[PDB]
Symmetry: C3
Subunit: 529 residues, 3 copies
C-alpha cells in the first residue's frame, strides 16, 4: 500500500526569486509604436511572470470620453521575446488577451473600473476628463505554465522583449467633440516591464517545448483560409472579427463600465427613446424630411403599418402633445420589400414628462431590441446598400454618437453572441480532418477551458512540461502539411443590417517549438516530430 498521509520530502534546488523592473525604450519612427525592454541582469539563471505596466496621462479638454475595459491588454498589438535577433516566443495582442480572460483579478489589473470606463465629460479646455492612472497587463507566457519548471533559462544571453502597440484610439471611446488626434499625437508611451528572475545554484538547462500561436487573417468577407507549413499543431482556433474602419467605427451608444449584453441593449434603447418620443407644442422640427413623426392618439396606440406601439406619457402640459418617431432607423436592400425598422421593435413605452428638465423620464419600455441591433454601426445604417435614408435621428442625437475601435472584438456584435458561422470544414492535406454543421467545437472549447466564444479544435490533452506535447503531425509523403479551413455564413434576414457589417476570418494555429540552451537560446520549429 502507498501512503497518502506521509511522504519523504525532497530538498529542492537552491534558488532565490527576485522582482526585476526595466524601463522601456520607445521607438515612434515606424507606423506602429514599439517599446523595447532589455533583460540586463546577469546574476539570474531563469525568468518568468512578465508584467507590462503602462502609465496613462491625465486627459484634459472638452468632449466626452471613456476607456474601453482592459486598457493594458487592448494597447498591445504584438509581444516578442528575442535572444540576439532570434525570436524565442511571440504572440499577438488578441491571443494574449484571450489567454488571460479567465483570471478576474489579473484582468482587473489591466484597468476595469467606473472611473476608467464610464463616459466622462469635459466642458472647458482645463476640465479633467480622466485622471492619470497606471494599468498592468500580465503577459502570460508558456514559461509560467508550471512555475519554476517552465521558466525561460538564461545563460549569458541578451534577452530582449519588444512590445508593438495599437493606436491609442483603439483603447478609447469618444464623441465628436473630443480631440482624440491631439492626445494621440502627444501621448507619452511611458511603460515598464516587470518579471520574476531566479538566482539558481547549479542550473543545467534541459531542452523544453513551448507552443507559439500563429495567426492568419483573411481578406474582408473571405470564408477560406490556408495555413501552410503545419507540422506540429496543438490546437486550431477559428473565429470572425468585425472590420470597424472609418465611418464604421461610429456607434449610437456604448454602455461604458457596465459590459453585460443587457447593459449594451439598455444604453442603445435609452439613446433611441431620447429621440423616438417627443413632447412639443407643434410638429417637431429639425428631423430629416424622410422622418415620419405622428401624433399619439388619445387611446395611446400608434399603428406603424401592422404593428402597434402603446405610448403613455404622464404629466404632459396642457398645450403640449406627444409625438412618436415611426422610422427612426430603417434598412432595406430593395424597394417594396420588408423594412428593418427600429421603431417597430417597441410595443409599449411609458414615462413621465419633467417640466424642470424639459425631457421625458422613461419608466418602462417593452421592446425586442437585441445586441445585434445595438452593434450595428451608423455607417451600415447609412451605407449605399440602404435604399432608404437610414438615419432619421435629429442632429443632437446624431451628435451624441460615439467612436469605438476596440481591437479584440469577435463576431459581429459587441458580446459575440450571434454566431455568423454555420458550417466549418477543416482539411489536412487532401483529406477532411473535421467537419461540423453547428458550433460543436465552440461548446468543446468552452468545456475544455479554451478561448471563450470561438471554435477550437484541441489536439493536445497531454500534461505540460513533464511530457512532450501531443500535436497534429504532418505526413509529407501524403502531402499532409497544410490546413485549409472553409466556413459558411449563417443565414440571416436580407433586410437585417447586421448581415452587411464587414467581417474578417481569423485562424489561429498553436505550433510546437523546441527550446534548446546548448548554444544560447534557440527556438526550433518542430518538424516531422
Amino acid at each position: 500500500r502507498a501512503s497518502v498521509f506521509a511522504t519523504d520530502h525532497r530538498a529542492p534546488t537552491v534558488y532565490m526569486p527576485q522582482y526585476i523592473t526595466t524601463q522601456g525604450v520607445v521607438d515612434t519612427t515606424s507606423d506602429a509604436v514599439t517599446v523595447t525592454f532589455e533583460i540586463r541582469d546577469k546574476y539570474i539563471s531563469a525568468m518568468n511572470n512578465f508584467v507590462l505596466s503602462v502609465d496613462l496621462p491625465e486627459i484634459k479638454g472638452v468632449g466626452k470620453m471613456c476607456y474601453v475595459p482592459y486598457i493594458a491588454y487592448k494597447l498591445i498589438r504584438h509581444v516578442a521575446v528575442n535572444s540576439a535577433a532570434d525570436t524565442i516566443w511571440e504572440t499577438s495582442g488578441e491571443e494574449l488577451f484571450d489567454s488571460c480572460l479567465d483570471n478576474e483579478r489579473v484582468m482587473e489589473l489591466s484597468g476595469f473600473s467606473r472611473e476608467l470606463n464610464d463616459l466622462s465629460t469635459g466642458s472647458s479646455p482645463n476640465d479633467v476628463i480622466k485622471e492619470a492612472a497606471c494599468v498592468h497587463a500580465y503577459i502570460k507566457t508558456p514559461f509560467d505554465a508550471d512555475k519554476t519548471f517552465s521558466t525561460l533559462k538564461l545563460s549569458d544571453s541578451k534577452v530582449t522583449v519588444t512590445v508593438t502597440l495599437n493606436p491609442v484610439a483603439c483603447v478609447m471611446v469618444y464623441d465628436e467633440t473630443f480631440d482624440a488626434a491631439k492626445l494621440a499625437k502627444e501621448f507619452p508611451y511611458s511603460m515598464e516591464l516587470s518579471f520574476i528572475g531566479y538566482m539558481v545554484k547549479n542550473l543545467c538547462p534541459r531542452p523544453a517545448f513551448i507552443e507559439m500561436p500563429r495567426r492568419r487573417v483573411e481578406q474582408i468577407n473571405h470564408t477560406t483560409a490556408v495555413i501552410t507549413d503545419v507540422h506540429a499543431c496543438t490546437s486550431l482556433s477559428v473565429y470572425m472579427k468585425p472590420v470597424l474602419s472609418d465611418a464604421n467605427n461610429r456607434f449610437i451608444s456604448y454602455p461604458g463600465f457596465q459590459q453585460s449584453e443587457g447593459d449594451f441593449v439598455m444604453a442603445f434603447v435609452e439613446r433611441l427613446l431620447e429621440d423616438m418620443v417627443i413632447v412639443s407644442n407643434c410638429y417637431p422640427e429639425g428631423f430629416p424630411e424622410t422622418a415620419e413623426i405622428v401624433e399619439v392618439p388619445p387611446s395611446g396606440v400608434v399603428s406603424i403599418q401592422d404593428t402597434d406601439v402603446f405610448v403613455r406619457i404622464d404629466d404632459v402640459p396642457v398645450g403640449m402633445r406627444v409625438f412618436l418617431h415611426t422610422n427612426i432607423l430603417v434598412f432595406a436592400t430593395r424597394k417594396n420589400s420588408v423594412v428593418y425598422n427600429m421603431s417597430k421593435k417597441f410595443s409599449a413605452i411609458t414615462g413621465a414628462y419633467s417640466r424642470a428638465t424639459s425631457r421625458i423620464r422613461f419608466t418602462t419600455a417593452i421592446h425586442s431590441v437585441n445586441i445585434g441591433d445595438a452593434s450595428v454601426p451608423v455607417g451600415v445604417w447609412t451605407c449605399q446598400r440602404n435604399v432608404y435614408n437610414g438615419d432619421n435621428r435629429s442632429p443632437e442625437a446624431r451628435a451624441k454618437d460615439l467612436f469605438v475601435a476596440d481591437p479584440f472584438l469577435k463576431g459581429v456584435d459587441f458580446k459575440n453572441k450571434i454566431d455568423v458561422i454555420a458550417r466549418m470544414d477543416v482539411r489536412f492535406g487532401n483529406e477532411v480532418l473535421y467537419s461540423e454543421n453547428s458550433a460543436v467545437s465552440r461548446v468543446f472549447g468552452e468545456i475544455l477551458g479554451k478561448t471563450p466564444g470561438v471554435r477550437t479544435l484541441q489536439f493536445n490533452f497531454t500534461p505540460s512540461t513533464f511530457f512532450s506535447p501531443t500535436a497534429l503531425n504532418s505526413n509529407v509523403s501524403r502531402g499532409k502539411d497544410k490546413l485549409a479551413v472553409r466556413v459558411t455564413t449563417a443565414h440571416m434576414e436580407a433586410h437585417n443590417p447586421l448581415m452587411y457589417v464587414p467581417r474578417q476570418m481569423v485562424v489561429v494555429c498553436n505550433e510546437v517549438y523546441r527550446l534548446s540552451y546548448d548554444a544560447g537560446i534557440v527556438a526550433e520549429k518542430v518538424t516531422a516530430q
Copy 2:
C-alpha cells in the same frame, strides 16, 4: 537535491483526439421519452467529454412563458452508458446537474440568458414567444476526471448512451393562457450527442475504478431512509425536495432571468403590491367577500390589529381615495390562534399614482417578506388545512399566476436557504456512524467542494485514477451492509404555511465500481473490498 527548474520529459502515448457527433433516436412509446445514441466508431480506442445538444423549437401563440435556467440539464431525468445491454455508468439528472453547477461557462451553455429565462408574452396566435435556440448539457462523467487517464476504453464494443427526459413542462414557467399541453404534444425531441474520441496506438486497457451515484427517494413526508447492499460508498448525501404536484405548482410570481434570493422576493413583493394598494373612487370591488379592504386615513397609517402600515401615495386625483388590502394572503390551522398575514409583513409603502396608466408606480416598500413566503404555492395558501379563505386577491392578480415544475429544487424554498432538517443520524448496520444536531455536514460539503446546499458525508479523500478510491466498507459478519438515515424536521411556527409544503427525503450514495476490459466492457460493483 531534486530539481524544480529542469525535468527529463517523457514521450506520451501516440494518440489523436477527434470530435464526434451522433444523432439521437427518439422513443416516445413509454411514459418517459428516451433518446438513444449509438457509438458507431471502430477506429477510436478511448472516449470522454460527453455533451448533449438539444434543439429548442420556436414557441408561438398567446400567453406568457419563460424557460427555467439551465434548460439542457433540467430536461434530463436519467443518463445511462451501456455496453451490450450492460450498464457501464448511469446517473440521475439531478446528480449530473449538481456535479456541473460549479462551472459557470458550462452552465451558461445549458441556456441561461435574458432571451431564454425572462417572461415573454404572446398576444396573437402568430406571435413568437420564444425564438428557436440550441442548448448544451455537458454530461460530466468519471471518464473526464483525469483527462486521457480516466477515459472509457473501447475494444470492439457497442457502447450506447440512453437519455431519459423529464416532461417538457418541467423546463417551462407559464401562465394559465399559455397552451403548454399542445406544445408538449408537438415538441420535436431533436438532440445530438457529442464526445471526444481518441485514436490510440498500442493501447492496453487496465482495470479502473469509477463511482456511480445511487439515488433513493422516500415517500412523501417520510423522515427515514434505508439503503441496502452498501459495500463501498465514497460519499453519502441527504437533502429534502419539494413535491410540486398539481395545484402545488401554481405560484404567485417567478423572477425569470434574475435568480438571486432578493430577485425572488422582489418579484413576489411587486406582485403583492399590485393588489394590496388600490386607488379608486368608491370602495374597491371584485375581491372575495372575506377580503378586508380599508381606506387609508389622512395620517397615512393603517392599523392591522397591533401592526401599523404607513401608506403614502403621491398624485392621487382629487375625487379618488387610497385603499389598503389588510388580509391579502392569510393562513392558520386553528381558529382564534395567531394568523400568518402577508399584509402585516409591510411596514411602509410609498409610491406615485400614474394617470396615464391608471396604476401606482411604487418607489419604496419596507417589508419583512422572505424567500419562504415567496416560495409558498397557491395550493398551500388555499389548502383544506387553512381555516381561512387563504387567497383574497382579485381575479386579475390570480390570473397573473405562474406554473413552475423545476425538477431540481431542493429544500422547501426556491433558493434552498431555509433548512428543514434539524438533526441527522446515520447508522451503518446496528451502530451509529454519524450524528449531528446542526448542519455540520452541509458546511463540510461547502468547504470540500461537494454538492452545494446539501448535507454530505465524504469518505474518500484519496486522489483519483492513480489510487484506488477509499470508501466506507461493509463488514457482513457484524451486519454492516446497510445505511439507515433518520432526520428530524426543523421547528417552524405552526401558522407558517411553509411547514405544510409537501417534501420528499432524498439519499444519494456514491458507490465504487470496477471497470474491466478483459472481455468487453464490464462494470462490477465492488463487494466486500
Copy 3:
C-alpha cells in the same frame, strides 16, 4: 513512451474520515474573550479542515444595526493550535481572513447575506432587529494544503485550539440609538469547533514543514518596521491599516450588503443629497451658523466660488423655494488656502419633490465623489487640524451617522483602492533586498494569487508537502538576520482630509517551522537552515 491512458493504481493506506464537533469553553476574565476547544478523541491519528461555528443571538430593541460582511471571520482576533502548552500553529484573524477571501462559497458561509448585512431598524424595545443566525469560519491551516498528506498527526497528544475574539462591536454597524454596549455585555459566546479526523491504520508520522505568519504592527503613522530573528521566510507582506479608535469610527454612511465601490459612493451620495437640497417656504433653519445655504435661481445654476451646480427639482409647490447647501463638509489646514468642499463635488442635481413624504426623490446626480471621500470619518472632518467648522449638516442628518469598527480594513478607504504607499525598501541585514517606486509587488501578489490588495514579496515557488519549502535564508556571519521595511507615503493634496486619517503599518513575515512527531507534537522554528 510513458502511457497517458492507463496507469497501475496503488492501494492507499487504510483510513476512515469522520466529522468531529467539540464544544467551546468560554473565558471572559481577561481583556479579550477566549474560547478553548479540547481535541478529546484518542482513536483518530490525523486531523485537518477546522471549522468554527458561531451562534448569533436574536437582536431586539430600538435603533438601527447591521452586521459587517463575513461575521464569523471578523469575530476572530487570533487562533492558536497547541499541544501540551506548546504552539503547533497560530495566526491572526486578519491573516486567516486574507487567506480565505478567494473562496466565495466559504466566505458566504461566514455570514454574507441581505438579512444579516443590510441595515435593520427597531422602533420598540420588543422589535426584532436581527433574527438569530449561525455562521461558520473555515479555519484554513497548512494541514489542508495537500488533503491527507498535510494532515496534523496525533500520537496520544492533547491538542487544544484557542480562539481569541475581537469585541462584538467590531462585527456591527449601528447608529447612536442602538444599545451596542448592553448587547456586548449580554452576548453569549456559544461556539463549536468542527474538524475531520482520520482513523488511520499503521500510520508512521514523518517530519513536516509548515509556515506560520508573524505579524508586526508599527506605531501610528510610523513608516519603518524591523523584524528580528528572520531565518526562513517564504513571503513578506506589507500594507497599511486605518486606526479608528473613538470618534474616528463614526461615518456618514455604510452601504450594508452591497459592498462594491460604487455602492459605498452611492450610499454616501444619498446621505449627502438628503441634506444638501432643501425645499422650504422660508430660509432653512437648524443648520449651524457657518452653513452657507443659498436659494436656487430660476436658471437653476448655483455658483460656489468658480464652481457651478445645476439644480432642477420638479413639482415644487407654489409657495416653496429650493435651497442648496454650498458647504456641507469642508476641510482645510490653513486659512485662505484651497478648501476641500464636498458640495463642490456636484455638477448637476435633478429630482422631483414628493408632497406625500415631504421629501425629494432624486433621479440623477452628476458628481465627482470618490471612495476616499466616502471613507473619511466624521472625526477627521471635525478634527482640530481643520481650520473650518467641518460638519455643517443638520442635527437629523448627523443623527443618521453610523459607527464602524471593522477589524480587517486595509489602506485608508473602505475598498483599499487608494494606495498610500509610494516607495518601499526592504533591507535584509545591511544590504538592500528589494526596492520599488510603484506597486510592482502588489501586481505580483495579484498575479500569484496572494493576499489581495497588499504588497507581497514571494520567496517560495516550490510545491508544498512534497518538497521542503524554499525561503529567504539568514546568514548570521554577514549579519543577515533581520528585515527592515521602509515606506514613503504617497503624495496627497494638503487640503484632502484623507491625508489625516490615522494609519498603522503592518508587516507580515511567513516563517518556516519544522513539525516533528518523535516525542509528542513539537514545532521548531527553522533557524539557519
